[PDB]
Write a protein that binds this ligand. Structure first.
Ligand SMILES: O=C(Nc1ccc(F)cc1)C1(c2ccc(-c3ccc(C4CC4)nc3)cc2)COC1
Length: 374
């Protein structure tokens, strides 16, 4: 058993199970905007609309799911407001009527006031048919930015990979129990199962091509996911009017915000967040952009003993082969993510009349390769 305090689902892992679609009536003015962003942005009514909103309390967002749906709604509106039509005409100040509730809600959920992976992937989905299984074809996102933005493809394939890797997450207790009870055969079986789920996760990742378009992604969706930390477009950051007197920098959406993106590297003793390098700094900093229960989960993995030391100590080819099966699977995932960045960011950028992400991932991959045993 993984503790329920870590918010991990048997079926969907780190994803929020059955995310709420609708808010209470008190927040109808937020939902009218968030549900109609494609029209409200393409006609320039979005910015004016947000300015005409009253400042609403967060006291009526009672349960976790409602609070998370609101974080998604406000996060998407914040991005839509800041970036507008997404042609470099930017807002350096977020209006108090939306800033105050978003910042208060954010502090309550222990997340930064900006759209993160946990919002727009982990909570931004529904099933069409509850009886049918979790396939792309039985699924939809709750919110989008623009028509043709491929948010469905981008978020749902991302989500499907998260789900696929969650099959391994439930093996992790088996892994730690087998070490302390010195159960070689159990540990071997666990590591081969983990390798198998990450192999499946990669096959799932292939769907990205079927549902996402390079032009659309680069020109449109990338812009809406962009944040304001070390971004020339908002040099000093964003002003959360009525909450902070001074502007504040926050990072945009990133796969590094996925707890699955990190947790196996941790489990397998791949010291990604050790180094003192930019990649190690980035990964650690993104733990603050994950929900608190999830970042706690990563922390408890780190506190448990080292799987890598355990395998190394034993002089056991079979265990080393199973540990390496897992390492190989992660390498492949990194390699694949790089091909996606190449097709969807590098090449489109070149046609415009990526590099930092490439170098970031090359380092992560290289650190992974160097963790192989044989
Ligand atoms: O960028 C991505 N989604 C993304 C979504 C929302 C954002 F706000 C920002 C980004 C993509 C991606 C998806 C999964 C991984 C991934 C998941 C697990 C692992 C295992 C190895 C640990 N590896 C990779 C990497 C990227 C989708 O296509 C690119």
């Amino acid at each position: 058993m993984i503790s329920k305090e870590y918010h991990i689902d048997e079926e969907v892992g780190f994803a929020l199970p059955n995310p709420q679609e609708n808010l209470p009536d008190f927040y109808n003015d937020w939902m009218f905007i968030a549900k109609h962003l494609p029209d409200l942005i393409e006609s320039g009514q979005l910015r004016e609309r947000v300015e005409k909103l009253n400042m609403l309390s967060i006291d009526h967002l009672t349960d976790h799911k409602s609070q998370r749906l609101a974080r998604l709604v406000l996060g998407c509106i914040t991005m839509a407001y800041v970036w507008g039509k997404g042609h470099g005409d930017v807002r350096k100040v977020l209006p108090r009527n939306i800033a105050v509730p978003y910042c208060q809600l954010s502090k309550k959920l222990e997340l930064p006031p900006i759209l993160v992976y946990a919002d727009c992937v982990l909570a931004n989905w529904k099933k069409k048919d509850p009886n049918k299984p979790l396939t792309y074809e039985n699924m939809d996102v709750l919110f989008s930015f623009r028509d043709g933005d491929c948010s469905k493809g981008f978020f749902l394939v991302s989500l499907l990979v998260e789900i696929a890797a969650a099959s391994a997450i439930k093996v992790i207790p088996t892994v730690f129990k087998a070490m302390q009870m010195q159960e070689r055969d159990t540990l071997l079986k666990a590591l081969l199962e983990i390798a198998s789920c990450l192999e499946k996760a990669l096959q799932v990742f292939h769907q990205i091509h079927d549902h996402v378009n390079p032009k659309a992604f680069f020109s449109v969706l990338r812009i809406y996911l962009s944040g304001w930390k070390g971004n020339p477009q908002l040099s000093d950051g964003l002003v959360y009017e009525g909450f902070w007197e001074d502007p504040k920098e926050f990072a945009g959406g990133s796969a590094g915000q996925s707890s699955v993106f990190q947790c196996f590297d941790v489990l397998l003793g791949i010291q990604q967040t050790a180094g003192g390098g930019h990649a190690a700094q980035f990964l650690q900093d993104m733990r603050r952009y994950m929900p608190p229960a999830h970042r706690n989960f990563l922390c408890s993995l780190e506190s448990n003993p080292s799987v890598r030391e355990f395998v190394l100590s034993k002089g056991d080819a079979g265990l080393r082969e199973a540990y390496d099966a897992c390492v190989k699977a992660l390498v492949s995932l990194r390699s694949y993510h790089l091909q996606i960045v190449t097709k969807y960011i590098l090449i489109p950028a070149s046609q415009q009349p990526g590099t930092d992400l490439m170098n970031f991932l090359k380092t992560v991959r290289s650190t992974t390769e160097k963790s192989l045993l044989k």
